[PDB]
Amino acid sequence: KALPRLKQRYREEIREALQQEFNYANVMQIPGVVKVVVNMGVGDAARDAKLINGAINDLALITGQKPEVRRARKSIAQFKLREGMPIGARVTLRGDRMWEFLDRLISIALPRIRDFRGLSPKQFDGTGNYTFGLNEQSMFHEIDVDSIDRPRGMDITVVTTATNDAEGRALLRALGFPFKEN
RNA sequence: AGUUUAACUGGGGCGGUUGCCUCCUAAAAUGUAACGGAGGCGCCCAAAGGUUCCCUCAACCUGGACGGCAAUCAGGUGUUGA
Known part of the structure; x- marks a missing residue:
């Protein structure tokens, strides 16, 4: 008895839009993020x-x-x-926790990077798995950003059942990753 | 004063070696020599033993913050070269 934001959105709009874009026979072919x-x-x-x-x-x-x-x-x-x-x-990360994490990341931190022009559309690979990276952890309000003794960056990568980069970028756009629209 | 002071050895000496494991010579069973050719040992082990259960590496291709030929990650090829 609950629904995260991005997941309700996913089951409402995004599946529809990708259907109306790529015209799959079975809906099982629809792209879906698995894990983070x-x-x-x-x-x-x-x-x-x-x-x-x-x-x-x-x-x-x-x-x-x-x-x-x-x-x-x-x-x-x-x-x-x-x-x-x-x-x-x-x-x-898998499931509701994953969708919550993406909500937080897209809505708190990535709008807190310094001079964020855009994440490239070119961090994909083979079919549409987006592998970007962060220099510092000075951004998550989750973090107690007073106690940190050093920068300890990280590397994130997002994997999806998409079969190609076009479907991957389209899905992640519908889900609201700030690509460099080009 | 009584006695010892090795052997092999393409004469003896000098050198080197003497026991055990593995490979070739070794001639498709076993076995087989040479001062013939290459190596190694005189250990370690609350686990590197027993049992039940589970999984598959190396390598390459790509993505990727510091990170480069390679560090940890993700995704494919990968019957097996780790």
Whole structure:
């Protein structure tokens, strides 16, 4: 007994508009976002093993779920990197929590970037999966932006059952990502 | 004063070596020598053992903030080259 904003919108308008654009036979062919992905590469694992915990805490406060700590399966010593050194955190988002996260991101933070002209239409890949990146976490009001001791940027990537970049960009437009309309 | 002070060895000496594991020589069973050719061991292990369950890598292509030939991520090819 509840509905998020973007999901109600998705089931109302966007499916209709893509149908009226691309004319699929079955509606099962309709594109739909599955999951959302978050990652943070600490990179100074061999110099600060504590920024890892810092990033864990930030993403906790940001996404409302305890992250995963991705280990280094290979040992490349030109970076000090050794088998099992924690280099980064990672979180998966699916469902109502995902739609809420996109609502927050599109409505609070991305309208808080400094001189946001536009996210490119060219972060796609093969079929329409949008892989962008943030330099700082100085933007989410979710975050306690008084306590941060360093910039700890991140990298986001958005995956969809779309089959090509045209359908991907069209769907993400209907959903309200500020592309550079070109 | 009584006695020891090695062997192999293309004579002896000098050098090197002596035991165990793996490969070729070794001649499609086994086995087979040379001071013939290449290596290694005289350990480690609250788990790197037992059991039940689950999953598949490396590599390449692309996207991608610092990040580059490569770091973590996502998406494909990938019968198996890790």
